[PDB]
C-alpha cells in the first residue's frame, strides 16, 4: 500500500543496529531519578553507611553509556540517512529528465520533504522508545500510580486537539484574508501611473482600510481563543501533577510504598509530560511529510549498431509528424524525403507546420507520428543511444552554449574531450574565436550559464563551432539564419559547402538563408503538412514554382 | 540602535493592553515560581508525621497558586497576541499610505515583487518585537532572578555550585549558536549551486537531448549533491557532539549536586522536602537561561528588518509642492516652451529636446512620428506626472504645478493604448476616481463611448464583475471601457493614445464630437495618416524634435 518505505531495502542492517543503540541509551537515562529515591531513603533510615558510593557509581556509569550510545546511535542514522538521501535525489532527477521535450519544482519538493521526514523520524524513534521504556521502569515502582497516569493521559491527548482545531481554523482564515488584503495593494501599485493619473491616491487608501477593518474584527476572536488554548494545556498539565501527589500521599501513608518511591514518580512523571508532548507535536509534521511525498512516487515509478559517423543514407515513407500536446495536433504527413552522403539541401515552410518535429524526428529524439523512416538503411532506434547521437548532430532552433569555457564547453557527451587549442581552432574555423578571443582568458575563459556570455551574434557561431567540433557525416539546422547577422551565417554556409565535407558528409538546413537557397543541391518544402515545394530558389523560380510566386 | 525607539513609540496607542498584560505577566511568574516550593513542603510534611491539618492546607495553597499562574498565563498570552494584531494592522495602513505619495520614477525602478515581500511578509516581523520578543526576554529574566532567590532561601551553600557551572553552558551555547549558523550557510551555498545545476538543465533541455548527454547532467548533480552530503554530515555530527558535552555536563552538576546535598542532609540545614524543591528548581533554570541568550538572536532579526520598512517610510518624494489654484472655469489652452525631459533612472538622454507648441480649445492636434514611441512622454508630461527638466508648461497661461492635484485631473484626462482596469464591477471602473457618480450619468457615458451596446449582455448590466487586471474582458471591450472612463469625467483637455488599435475612424469621431472634444482640446497620437482627415494641425516627432 504505502510506497514511502520502498527505499529502505538497501540498508536494513544499519537501522536495526540503530534501534538496539536507542533502547540501550533509553534504559541508561532512567537511572538518574531511580537512584535519587534510593539514596534519599538510605540516609533518612540509616547513617552514612558507605552504601551510597556503590549506588552513586552506577548512576554515573549508566547515564554515560546513554550519552555515548546515543551519539554512536544517531551518528550512524544521519550518516546512513544522507547516503540514501543522496541516491534518492539523483534518481528522482534521473527520472524527470527521461521525458519528452514538451519543471525544477519536482526536485524542489523532494529537496524539502526529505529533510523534513528524515529529521522528524529520528525524533519519533528516540522518544517513542524513551516513552515506552520510561513506562517500563515506572511500572516497576508502583502499579497504582501507573494506572492513574495512564487514565489521565488521553485527556492531554484529546482536549488540546479539540481546542487546537478551533485555533487552526481561525489562524488560517486570518492568514488567507491578510494575503487577499495585501494582494489588493499590489494591484494598485502595479498600475500606479493610472492611479496618479486619476487622482484616486486617497481612494485606494480608503479601499485598503475597508479590507483591513474586516480583519480587525476577526482578530478579536483570534485572541480570545488563545487563552483557552493556553488554559487547556496549562491546566491539564497541572491537574495531573496535583493528582499524582494526592493519590501518592494516601498510598504512601497506607504503608504500601516508601517516601522515596514517591520521589522517583515525581521526577518520572515530569519527564513523561515533555516526552508525550514532544512526540505528539511532531506527529502532524511527519504525517504531512509522508502524505505529500507520495506525489513524488508518480515520477519515480513513472541497438546493435555503434556508429562513430552516419553512413549518410536516409529515406522516408508516408511519415507524419505531430505536436506533443495532443494526437490531434498533427502538423505533417505523407513525408517521403530521402538523403544521401554529399547532399546539400535547404528547407522552408509555414511556421509550426511540422518543420521542427521533422528535425527532431531525424535526430530520433521523438518517434514519427505515422508512416516509416530509416537512416543508413536501418531504423533509427537500431543504434546505441550515445553512438547514434554521435552519428549525426544538428544546430538547435535557439543557439546557445553551456556555462563552460570555449576550450571545454563543446566536449559535452563526447567520450574523448578534444584539445583546448583544438577547441580554439574549431572556434576560428566557425568564426566564434573572433569574439571568443575577447574573453578574459580567451578560449579558457568560462562562458556565462545558459549562453549569457554573449548575444545572438556569437551564440549562432558558437552552435556551429559545437557542431564543427564533432564534424559529423550528417548535419542539420533549423531557423539558424535568424539568430545572428545574415552575411556571416551565409558565409558560414558557403564555407561548409566549400569544405571537403561536401563529399565526406551531408547537411540539410531548414532556414531561409540566401546562400543555402542558391547553393542547394536539392531541397524539399512543405505546405499545410504535406510536401508541396522543393529545389533551389533560382531553379524553382525558373520553373514557375512557389519561389516564382513569392516574387509578387 | 536608536531605531528601536521609533518602533517602541509606535505601540503607545495600545497602552490599555500592554499595561494590563504586563500586570498579568508578573502575576503569572510569581504564581509559577512558588509551586515547586510547596511541592517539597508537602513531601516534607508527609514524612515523620500524619497531620491532615498540615497536609490538606499545603495542597490547597499549592493548587491555588499554580491555578492562578495557569489562568494568568492564558490571559497574559491572550492580550499580547491581540496587541500583535493591532500593531500589524496599523503599520500596513501607514506603509501603504506612505508609498502612494512617492513619485512615478520610484516605481519604475522598484519591482512589485520586492514591495510585496516588504509589505505583506516583512511587516509581520515588525509586530513580533514588543508583543513576542520583549516578553520572552522579560518573562525569562524575571524568572531567573526570582528562582535564584528561592535557591538562596533553601541553602546558600548549595546554590554557589550552580553559579560556577552555569557560565560553562552559556559559553558552549554561544559557540554553538554561531558555529551551526556558519556551517548552515556553507550547506546553503552548496545547495544553491545544486539548484543552479537543475535550473540550467531545465531551461535548455533541447540542447541536452540532441545527444546522449544526460550522463553529464547527473554527474553535475551527483557531485554537487555529494558536497551537500559531506557538508550535511559535518553539521549534525557537531550537533550530536554538542549534545553529548551538554548532557555529560548535566552530570557535572547532579553528580556533584547530590554529593553536597546528601552530606548536608546528614549534617543538617536540609530535608528531603527541601531538597526536592531545589532538585526541580535546577533543571528549569538551565532551560530558561539558555532561552534568554537564544531570544537575543531574534531581537536583532526583527530590529534588522526595521531598516527595510522605515527606509520606504522616510523616503522623501521629489515631487513639487501640491498646487492650490482651482478656477471656476477653464478655457483649456495648453502652451509649451523649450520643454525637455529624461527619465531619472535613464538620465542624460533627453527624449524630448526643446519642444514648443500650443493647443486651443476649438481645434484638434495630432502627433505623428515614431521617435521610438517616445511621443508617449508628452502624454505623461501634460498630466503633471513627471516634471519638465528645462522650461515649463502653462495651462491657461499658468504653471501647471500651481493647480490643485485633485482638481487638475478632474479636467485633464488621458487614455493610453493599454486599457488598465481594476478588479470589481464595471460600474466601479467607469466612474473610477470620482467621489460619487449617478448611475444615470454612466449610462450616457457608456452609450457615448459605445460601450453600453455590449456590456448589457453581461449579468446585471453595469454591475457585472471584472476579473483582476481586466482578465475577464476582451481587449477590444477593454479599450471602450477606458474611453468611457475618460468621457464620464467631462474633461476639458483629452489625450488619446493610439486610438487606431481597435477604434475605427467613426468610433474615434464619436469621441471627437463629444462635449469634451466638440469645443475642447483633444490630443491624438498615432502612427498612421488616418488622423490627417480631421486634425486641425499636424506635428511630426523625429528624434525627439518637432519639425
Amino acid at each position: 500500500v504505502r510506497r514511502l518505505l520502498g527505499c529502505l531495502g538497501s540498508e536494513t542492517r544499519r537501522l536495526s543496529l540503530f534501534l538496539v543503540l536507542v533502547v540501550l541509551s533509553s534504559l541508561g537515562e532512567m537511572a538518574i531519578p531511580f537512584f535519587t529515591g534510593r539514596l534519599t531513603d538510605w540516609i533518612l533510615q540509616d547513617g552514612s553507611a558507605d552504601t551510597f558510593t556503590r549506588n552513586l557509581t552506577l548512576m554515573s556509569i549508566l547515564t554515560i553509556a546513554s550519552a555515548v550510545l546515543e551519539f554512536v546511535g544517531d551518528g550512524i542514522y544521519n550518516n546512513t540517512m544522507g547516503h540514501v538521501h543522496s541516491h534518492l535525489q539523483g534518481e528522482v532527477f534521473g527520472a524527470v529528465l527521461r521525458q519528452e521535450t514538451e519543471m525544477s519544482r519536482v526536485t524542489e519538493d523532494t529537496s524539502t520533504l526529505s529533510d523534513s521526514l528524515s529529521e522528524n523520524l529520528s525524533l519519533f524513534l528516540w522518544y517513542l522508545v524513551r516513552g515506552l521504556c520510561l513506562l517500563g521502569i515506572m511500572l516497576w515502582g508502583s502499579v497504582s500510580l501507573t494506572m492513574v497516569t495512564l487514565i489521565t493521559l488521553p485527556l492531554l491527548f484529546l482536549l488540546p486537539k479539540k481546542v487546537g482545531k478551533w485555533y487552526q481554523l481561525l489562524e488560517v482564515q486570518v492568514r488567507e484574508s491578510l494575503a487577499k488584503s495585501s494582494q489588493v495593494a499590489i494591484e494598485a501599485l502595479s498600475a500606479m501611473p493610472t492611479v496618479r493619473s486619476f487622482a484616486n491616491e486617497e481612494g485606494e487608501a480608503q479601499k485598503f482600510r475597508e479590507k483591513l477593518q474586516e480583519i480587525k474584527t476577526l482578530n478579536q476572536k483570534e485572541a480570545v481563543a488563545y487563552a483557552v488554548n493556553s488554559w487547556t494545556t496549562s491546566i491539564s498539565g497541572m491537574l495531573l501533577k496535583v493528582g499524582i501527589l494526592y493519590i501518592g500521599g494516601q498510598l504512601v501513608t497506607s504503608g504500601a510504598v516508601s517516601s522515596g518511591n514517591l520521589v522517583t514518580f515525581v521526577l518520572y512523571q515530569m519527564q513523561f509530560t515533555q516526552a508525550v508532548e514532544v512526540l505528539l507535536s511532531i506527529y502532524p509534521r511527519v504525517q504531512k511529510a509522508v502524505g505529500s511525498s507520495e506525489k513524488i512516487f508518480e515520477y519515480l515509478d513513472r541497438g546493435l549498431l555503434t556508429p562513430l559517423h552516419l553512413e549518410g543514407l536516409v529515406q522516408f515513407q508516408d511519415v507524419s509528424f505531430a505536436y506533443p500536446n495532443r494526437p490531434d495536433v498533427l502538423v505533417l504527413q505523407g513525408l517521403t524525403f530521402t538523403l544521401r552522403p554529399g547532399e546539400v539541401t535547404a528547407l522552408v515552410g509555414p511556421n509550426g507546420s511540422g518543420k521542427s518535429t521533422v528535425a527532431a524526428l531525424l535526430q530520433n529524439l521523438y518517434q514519427p507520428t505515422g508512416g516509416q523512416l530509416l537512416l543508413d538503411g536501418k531504423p533509427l532506434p537500431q543504434y546505441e543511444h550515445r553512438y547514434l547521437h554521435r552519428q549525426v548532430a544538428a544546430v538547435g532552433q535557439e543557439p546557445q552554449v553551456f556555462g563552460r569555457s570555449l576550450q571545454e564547453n563543446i566536449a559535452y557527451g563526447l567520450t574523448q574531450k578534444p584539445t583546448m587549442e583544438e577547441i580554439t581552432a574549431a572556434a576560428v574555423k566557425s568564426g566564434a574565436h573572433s569574439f571568443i578571443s575577447g574573453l578574459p582568458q580567451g578560449y579558457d575563459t568560462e562562458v556565462d550559464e545558459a549562453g549569457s556570455q554573449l548575444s545572438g551574434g556569437q551564440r549562432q557561431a558558437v552552435a556551429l563551432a559545437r557542431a564543427l567540433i564533432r564534424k559529423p557525416c550528417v548535419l542539420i539546422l533549423d531557423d539558424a539564419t535568424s539568430a545572428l547577422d545574415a552575411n556571416s551565417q551565409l558565409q558560414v554556409e558557403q564555407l561548409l559547402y566549400e569544405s571537403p565535407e561536401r563529399y565526406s558528409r551531408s547537411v540539410l538546413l531548414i532556414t531561409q538563408h540566401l546562400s543555402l537557397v542558391e547553393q542547394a543541391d536539392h531541397i524539399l518544402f512543405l505546405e499545410g503538412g504535406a510536401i508541396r515545394e522543393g529545389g533551389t530558389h533560382q531553379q524553382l523560380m525558373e520553373k514557375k514554382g512557389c519561389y516564382w510566386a513569392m516574387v509578387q | 540602535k536608536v531605531l528601536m525607539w521609533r518602533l517602541l513609540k509606535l505601540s503607545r496607542p495600545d497602552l490599555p493592553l500592554l499595561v494590563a498584560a504586563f500586570f498579568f505577566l508578573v502575576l503569572a511568574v510569581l504564581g509559577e515560581t512558588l509551586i515547586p516550593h510547596y511541592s517539597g513542603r508537602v513531601i516534607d510534611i508527609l514524612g515523620g508525621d500524619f497531620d491532615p491539618h498540615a497536609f490538606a492546607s499545603a495542597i490547597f495553597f499549592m493548587c491555588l497558586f499554580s491555578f492562578g499562574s495557569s489562568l494568568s498565563a492564558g490571559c497574559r498570552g491572550g492580550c499580547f497576541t491581540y496587541t500583535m494584531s493591532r500593531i500589524n494592522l496599523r503599520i500596513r495602513e501607514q506603509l501603504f499610505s506612505s508609498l502612494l505619495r512617492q513619485d512615478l520614477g520610484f516605481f519604475q525602478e522598484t519591482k512589485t515583487g520586492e514591495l510585496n515581500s516588504r509589505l505583506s511578509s516583512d511587516t509581520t516581523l515588525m509586530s513580533n518585537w514588543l508583543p513576542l520578543n520583549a516578553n520572552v526576554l522579560l518573562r525569562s529574566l524575571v524568572k531567573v532572578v526570582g528562582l535564584y532567590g528561592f535557591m538562596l532561601s533553601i541553602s546558600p551553600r548549595l546554590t554557589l555550585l550552580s553559579l560556577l557551572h552555569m557560565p560553562f553552558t552559556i559559553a558552549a551555547e554561544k559557540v554553538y549558536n554561531t558555529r551551526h549558523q556558519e556551517v548552515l550557510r556553507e550547506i546553503q551555498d552548496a545547495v544553491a549551486r545544486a539548484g543552479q545545476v537543475v535550473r540550467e538543465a531545465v531551461g535548455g533541455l533541447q540542447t541536452v537531448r540532441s545527444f546522449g548527454a544526460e550522463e553529464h547532467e547527473v554527474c553535475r548533480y551527483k557531485e554537487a549533491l555529494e558536497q551537500c552530503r559531506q557538508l550535511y554530515w559535518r553539521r549534525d555530527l557537531e550537533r550530536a557532539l554538542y549534545l553529548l558535552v551538554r548532557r555529560v555536563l548535566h552530570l557535572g552538576v547532579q553528580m556533584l549536586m547530590l554529593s553536597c546535598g546528601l552530606q548536608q542532609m546528614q549534617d543538617g540545614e536540609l530535608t528531603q522536602g527541601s531538597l526536592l524543591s531545589f532538585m526541580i528548581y535546577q533543571e528549569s533554570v538551565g532551560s530558561y537561561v539558555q532561552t534568554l541568550v537564544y531570544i537575543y538572536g531574534d531581537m536583532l532579526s526583527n530590529v534588522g528588518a526595521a531598516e527595510k520598512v522605515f527606509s520606504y517610510m522616510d523616503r522623501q518624494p521629489n515631487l513639487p509642492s501640491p498646487g492650490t489654484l482651482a478656477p471656476t472655469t477653464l478655457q483649456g489652452v495648453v502652451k509649451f516652451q523649450d520643454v525637455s525631459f529624461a527619465y531619472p533612472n535613464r538620465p542624460d538622454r533627453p527624449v524630448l529636446k526643446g519642444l514648443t507648441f500650443t493647443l486651443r480649445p476649438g481645434e484638434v492636434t495630432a502627433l505623428v512620428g515614431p521617435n521610438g514611441s517616445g511621443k508617449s512622454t508628452v502624454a505623461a508630461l501634460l498630466q503633471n506626472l513627471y516634471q519638465p527638466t528645462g522650461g515649463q508648461v502653462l495651462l491657461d497661461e499658468k504653471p501647471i504645478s500651481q493647480y490643485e492635484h485633485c482638481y487638475l485631473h478632474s479636467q485633464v484626462v488621458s487614455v493610453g493604448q493599454e486599457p488598465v482596469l481594476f478588479s470589481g464591477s464595471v460600474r466601479n471602473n467607469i466612474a473610477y476616481g470620482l467621489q460619487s457618480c449617478e448611475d444615470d450619468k454612466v449610462m450616457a457615458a457608456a452609450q457615448a463611448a459605445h460601450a453600453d451596446d455590449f456590456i448589457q449582455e453581461m449579468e446585471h448590466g453595469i454591475y457585472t464583475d471584472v476579473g483582476e487586471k481586466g482578465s475577464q474582458l476582451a481587449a477590444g471591450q477593454k479599450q471602450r471601457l477606458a474611453i468611457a472612463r475618460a468621457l464620464v469625467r467631462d474633461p476639458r483637455v483629452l489625450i488619446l493614445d493610439e486610438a487606431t488599435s481597435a477604434l475605427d475612424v467613426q468610433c474615434e469621431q464619436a469621441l471627437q464630437d463629444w462635449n469634451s472634444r466638440g469645443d475642447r482640446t483633444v490630443l491624438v497620437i498615432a502612427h498612421r495618416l488616418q488622423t490627417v482627415q480631421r486634425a486641425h494641425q499636424i506635428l511630426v516627432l523625429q528624434e525627439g524634435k518637432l519639425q
Binding site: 528516540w126 522518544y127 515533555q274 | 498570552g77 520572552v136 550530536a240
Partner: peptide, 8 residues
C-alpha cells in the same frame, strides 16, 4: 536526539 520559544 532530544528536543532543542514560540510561547508569548
Amino acid at each position: 536526539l532530544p528536543a532543542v520559544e514560540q510561547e508569548y
